[PDB]
């Protein structure tokens, strides 16, 4: 309900990383889910105030 | 907690749609939350960009 037919902004649950969409899949007695997310990466240091 | 105290952003969890605000009333041996909720509606096609 959350990921699939959502976007969760719940941190952790529907994947690692900031979530964007998920994908169902079935298996035999259970569901698989294919969390698509969002995670930077090579950062830069800047000054800040 | 999340539907009558708040407001939840959660997808189908405080009712089917977008969620605006919950009711609890009371029944024996439970609780009963009327969820009101948002669904749209009349739908009408358009170009996008
Ligand atoms: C930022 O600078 C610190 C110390 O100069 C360094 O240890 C750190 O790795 C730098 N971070 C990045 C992302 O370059
Ligand atoms: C939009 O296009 C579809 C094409 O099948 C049509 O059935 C529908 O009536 C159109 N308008 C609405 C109400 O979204």
Redesign the pocket.
Known sequence: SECVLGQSKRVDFCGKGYHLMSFPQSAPHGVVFLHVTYVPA????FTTA
């Open positions: 090579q950062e830069k240091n």
